[PDB]
Amino acid sequence: RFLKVKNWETDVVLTDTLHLKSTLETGCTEHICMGSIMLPTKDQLFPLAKEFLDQYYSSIKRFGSKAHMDRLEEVNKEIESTSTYQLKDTELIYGAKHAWRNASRCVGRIQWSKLQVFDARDCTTAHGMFNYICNHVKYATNKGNLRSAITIFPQRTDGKHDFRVWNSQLIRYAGYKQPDGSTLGDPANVQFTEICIQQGWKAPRGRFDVLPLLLQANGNDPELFQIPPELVLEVPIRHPKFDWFKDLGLKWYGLPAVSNMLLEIGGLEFSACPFSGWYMGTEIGVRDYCDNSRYNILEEVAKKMDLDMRKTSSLWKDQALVEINIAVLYSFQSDKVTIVDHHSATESFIKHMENEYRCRGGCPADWVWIVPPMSGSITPVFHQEMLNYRLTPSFEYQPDPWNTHVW
Amino acid sequence: RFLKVKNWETDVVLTDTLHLKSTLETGCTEHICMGSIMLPVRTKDQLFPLAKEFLDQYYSSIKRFGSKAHMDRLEEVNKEIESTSTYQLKDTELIYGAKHAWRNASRCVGRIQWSKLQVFDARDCTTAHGMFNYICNHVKYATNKGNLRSAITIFPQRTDGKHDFRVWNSQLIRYAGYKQPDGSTLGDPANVQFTEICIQQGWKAPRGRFDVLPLLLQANGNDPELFQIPPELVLEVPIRHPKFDWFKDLGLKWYGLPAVSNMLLEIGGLEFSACPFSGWYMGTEIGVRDYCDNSRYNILEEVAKKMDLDMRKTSSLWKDQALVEINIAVLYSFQSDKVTIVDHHSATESFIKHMENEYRCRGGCPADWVWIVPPMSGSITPVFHQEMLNYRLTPSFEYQPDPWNTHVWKG
Ligand code: HEM
Ligand code: HEM
Ligand SMILES: Nc1ccc2ccc(CNc3cccc(F)c3)cc2n1
Numbered sequence: 001r002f003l004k005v006k007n008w009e010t011d012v013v014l015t016d017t018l019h020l021k022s023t024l025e026t027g028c029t030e031h032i033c034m035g036s037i038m039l040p041t042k043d044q045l046f047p048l049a050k051e052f053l054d055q056y057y058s059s060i061k062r063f064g065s066k067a068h069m070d071r072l073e074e075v076n077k078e079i080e081s082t083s084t085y086q087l088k089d090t091e092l093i094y095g096a097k098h099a100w101r102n103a104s105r106c107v108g109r110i111q112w113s114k115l116q117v118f119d120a121r122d123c124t125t126a127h128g129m130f131n132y133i134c135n136h137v138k139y140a141t142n143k144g145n146l147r148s149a150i151t152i153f154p155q156r157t158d159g160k161h162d163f164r165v166w167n168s169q170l171i172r173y174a175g176y177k178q179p180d181g182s183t184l185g186d187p188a189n190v191q192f193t194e195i196c197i198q199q200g201w202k203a204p205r206g207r208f209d210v211l212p213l214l215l216q217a218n219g220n221d222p223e224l225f226q227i228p229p230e231l232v233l234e235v236p237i238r239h240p241k242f243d244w245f246k247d248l249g250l251k252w253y254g255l256p257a258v259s260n261m262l263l264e265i266g267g268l269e270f271s272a273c274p275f276s277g278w279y280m281g282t283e284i285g286v287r288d289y290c291d292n293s294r295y296n297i298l299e300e301v302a303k304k305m306d307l308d309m310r311k312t313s314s315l316w317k318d319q320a321l322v323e324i325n326i327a328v329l330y331s332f333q334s335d336k337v338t339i340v341d342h343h344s345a346t347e348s349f350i351k352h353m354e355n356e357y358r359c360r361g362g363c364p365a366d367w368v369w370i371v372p373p374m375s376g377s378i379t380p381v382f383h384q385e386m387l388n389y390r391l392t393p394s395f396e397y398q399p400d401p402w403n404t405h406v407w
Numbered sequence: 408r409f410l411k412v413k414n415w416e417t418d419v420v421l422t423d424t425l426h427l428k429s430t431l432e433t434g435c436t437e438h439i440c441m442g443s444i445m446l447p448v449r450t451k452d453q454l455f456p457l458a459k460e461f462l463d464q465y466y467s468s469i470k471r472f473g474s475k476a477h478m479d480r481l482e483e484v485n486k487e488i489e490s491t492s493t494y495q496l497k498d499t500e501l502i503y504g505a506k507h508a509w510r511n512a513s514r515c516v517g518r519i520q521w522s523k524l525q526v527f528d529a530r531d532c533t534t535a536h537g538m539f540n541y542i543c544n545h546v547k548y549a550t551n552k553g554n555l556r557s558a559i560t561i562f563p564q565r566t567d568g569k570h571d572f573r574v575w576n577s578q579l580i581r582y583a584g585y586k587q588p589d590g591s592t593l594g595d596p597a598n599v600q601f602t603e604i605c606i607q608q609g610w611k612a613p614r615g616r617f618d619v620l621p622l623l624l625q626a627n628g629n630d631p632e633l634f635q636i637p638p639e640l641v642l643e644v645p646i647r648h649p650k651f652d653w654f655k656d657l658g659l660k661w662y663g664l665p666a667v668s669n670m671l672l673e674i675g676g677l678e679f680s681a682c683p684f685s686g687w688y689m690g691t692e693i694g695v696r697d698y699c700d701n702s703r704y705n706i707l708e709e710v711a712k713k714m715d716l717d718m719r720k721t722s723s724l725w726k727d728q729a730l731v732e733i734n735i736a737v738l739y740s741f742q743s744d745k746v747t748i749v750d751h752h753s754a755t756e757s758f759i760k761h762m763e764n765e766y767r768c769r770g771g772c773p774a775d776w777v778w779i780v781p782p783m784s785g786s787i788t789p790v791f792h793q794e795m796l797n798y799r800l801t802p803s804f805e806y807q808p809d810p811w812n813t814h815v816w817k818g
């Protein structure tokens with residue numbers, strides 16, 4: 001019941017008690033592990049609020065206090081009365097920082113307590129949402145010196161008045177299906193680049209067109225807004241050796257801002273809560289650039305390197321994969337835009353695990369996601385045993401709006 | 408109950424029913440996943456159902472389920488158990504069990520080869536000397552002058568746990584590790600503790616960077632004995648790089664035959680504590696883990712220095728770069744010497760095909776994603792994007808405690 005994790009590279013053993021506070025489920029059973037599966041009323045609400053408020057008041061060392069008991073009382077009243085309740089700004093901030101702290105798939109959590117929270121709960125319209133999002137983007141971008149932020153739109157009420165950002169990230173590149181049959185731009189966003197035009201967007205049919213925001217306020221039809229280009233920081237990608245690299249025509253945006261997730265605090269559901277940090281270099285160079293179902297530029301880059309692409313045994317994909325990732329990092333760094341390499345970030349995570357085990361008694365972590373998509377075993381996390389479990393507050397996945405929107 | 412796995416690269420969805428025939432536990436619960444934990448004397452009481460379960464499996468495979476031959480064999484085994492408290496497998500059953508243990512090995516990317524396993528029945532063995540002979544023959548057969556063949560040699564099953572056959576080596580062929588007084592290590596740091604035991608057991612160590620360890624062999628629960636594998640039987644490959652001529656001068660070589668000797672084979676409740684098995688290497692095993700792990704030979708530094716890389720900032724990816732060339736060198740050297748080896752791209756690609764075939768013909772293929780995905784270049788192999796289900800089927804290979812920790816010394 002009191003669990004240990006061993007690091008096989010350093011013999012360091014940590015003991016995990018935190019997992020016993022776990023409330024949600026994993027998909028796994030004693031008979032089968034689903035560790036590699038990508039996505040496995042008034043009554044419900046007060047215990048949920050209670051547990052949250054209890055951990056909140058314990059964190060400020062006022063567990064079992066007047067204010068504590070009073071707040072529980074006050075929240076208990078408001079639920080009984082209104083069937084929902086509203087968070088204090090203090091609780092909202094604590095809640096958000098903690099959903100990030102608890103995101104078992106996030107390698108970047110060492111920075112969890114340094115989140116800028118923007119309370120956008122007074123928002124009523126898509127234009128309103130657009131305004132808050134532009135403010136978020138400008139604030140987080142910070143001329144290249146990136147700062148983590150989240151902007152929180154009103155909480156779900158009856159699932160009819162939902163606030164939703166339809167973009168999966170605030171900033172993504174368009175992708176267009178061709179008569180040629182191939183794909184121009186980012187193939188991940190073909191369907192979204194369609195719905196944008198299917199709702200009125202005028203695509204400049206390019207390779208790296210910044211997609212328009214599709215914003216849904218109070219469960220209404222979504223509206224298209226173009227983010228001011230001067231707010232979208234992009235990095236042209238060159239290699240610190242191969243000057244043919246610039247010719248490839250590649251760039252990427254500085255601000256990774258995940259916008260499709262659902263933030264759950266004390267039972268309350270924030271369906272629109274776009275958040276942003278900064279990139280680990282592999283996200284762009286390994287996944288965004290070299291994934292088969294993405295920009296898949298491996299074959300081209302290898303050719304330009306004149307590699308023996310005849311046999312897989314030459315490891316030409318590996319060679320190029322490395323150079324590509326060297327270039328992403330080099331471009332960002334030279335352009336003074338925040339980025340972290342997978343070595344630095346994984347090392348930071350181990351230190352953070354150490355810290356969390358020490359000061360909190362554990363740190364939930366999904367090894368399948370924490371290990372970088374390249375050079376896995378030359379990073380410390382590879383040899384780190386991890387325990388995966390779900391704590392609240394949390395970020396959860398949620399259905400794509402176009403499958404759900406009661407139009 | 409049906410279960411589905413999706414490949415996010417190809418959108419291929421598959422349906423698992425095989426997980427239903429799963430008995431053993433995972434370590435996971437509804438409230439915690441222990442998917443990245445490395446490792447999470449038996450009565451007749453529970454022996455009959457394990458025997459029966461196995462024999463039912465066996466007679467279905469040969470399409471004789473419920474036949475008279477099936478029934479009599481159940482009766483035969485039942486009788487032998489209540490009379491003797493254990494039982495003996497037929498040759499046919501032993502061969503079936505060993506192959507299926509491999510087929511069920513959820514952490515093995517090489518399972519496409521599962522049905523082509525050479526089973527050596529060493530159950531008539533009685534002494535360490537006999538064990539040495541059987542192993543010598545295994546090594547020679549499997550090695551096959553560089554054209555490697557999968558084999559497993561099976562020594563007598565456990566009885567009371569006091570007469571165990573064990574091979575004390577973790578692999579039949581492995582290099583010595585020596586701790587120096589200055590704290591540096593000479594050779595393979597993975598094998599320091601085992602090297603010490605050997606030395607204490609009377610081994611005269613050459614103390615070089617690539618000394619082949621002697622076999623330490625335990626028969627019938629007696630104290631282990633030291634044997635030197637004939638060097639002519641140990642096939643080795645000098646590591647060079649196709650473009651880098653300074654690479655030969657690094658002084659590296661590796662042995663051709665990966666032959667794991669410390670696992671336990673379970674078949675119908677029977678426990679085979681000595682069952683060394685061998686296949687061939689995937690390049691990354693040597694090139695990534697054996698050479699470049701910090702806790703191993705750890706040559707990244709020296710290789711990177713010789714390539715003149717920027718080693719001042721980690722963001723130069725010098726480690727990543729040096730890692731690739733080292734793995735290129737391993738593949739190149741092995742192929743150049745006509746010693747069987749497989750690259751991680753070929754191996755994972757073949758595994759996806761095997762896995763798909765298994766879902767179709769068997770209703771599933773248990774797979775441990777954490778182990779199946781190669782330790783470099785993960786997402787540029789098809790297994791990375793492949794959802795998998797992990798569950799335990801028998802027959803199976805299991806871990807077991809190191810013998811020096813449990814052994815009662817005779818003297
Ligand atoms: C500040 C620097 C940050 C870095 C370097 C970072 C890094 C990463 C990486 C590499 C992943 C793997 C995702 C993938 O490969 O597709 C990830 C996932 C994730 N991150 Fe972080 N992150 C950062 C900030 C944040 C912030 C500010 C939040 C929330 C407020 C957050 C929450 C999450 C969540 C919930 C996931 C998993 C999402 C899912 O399940 O799909 N991260 N992060
Ligand atoms: C024939 C070519 C083979 C290849 C290329 C291959 C490949 C691999 C690799 C790369 C691993 C991961 C081990 C690590 O990274 O440390 C593994 C694990 C494993 N292999 Fe295979 N293998 C082969 C044959 C065999 C055979 C013949 C058997 C048994 C008869 C076997 C049984 C296992 C088992 C039980 C594991 C899991 C070990 C553990 O849990 O520690 N393999 N294999
Ligand atoms: N660098 C970062 C920072 C935060 C992240 C949060 C989530 C994810 C997961 N990727 C993701 C999830 C949903 C939509 C999407 F477009 C990407 C990656 C991150 N990557």
Ligand SMILES: Nc1ccc2ccc(CNc3cccc(F)c3)cc2n1
Nearest residue numbers: 577578665667668669686687688689
């Ligand atoms: N190429 C192969 C073939 C079979 C294998 C079987 C097991 C393992 C796991 N590694 C291992 C297990 C026990 C001792 C040891 F030294 C290595 C790797 C394999 N690697």
Ligand SMILES: C[C@H](O)[C@H](O)[C@H]1CNc2nc(N)[nH]c(=O)c2N1
Nearest residue numbers: 382383384385443444445777778
């Ligand atoms: C913690 C984790 O279980 C451990 O480091 C694993 C990771 N995956 C692995 N995968 C393979 N193939 N071989 C290994 O030794 C390991 N080590």
Ligand SMILES: C[C@H](O)[C@H](O)[C@H]1CNc2nc(N)[nH]c(=O)c2N1
Nearest residue numbers: 036037038368369791792793794
């Ligand atoms: C099948 C598997 O769950 C899927 O490909 C995962 C593997 N690990 C990952 N890890 C990260 N960081 N991001 C991902 O998208 C994925 N994809």
Ligand SMILES: [Zn+2]
Nearest residue numbers: 028033435440
């Ligand atoms: Zn699990």
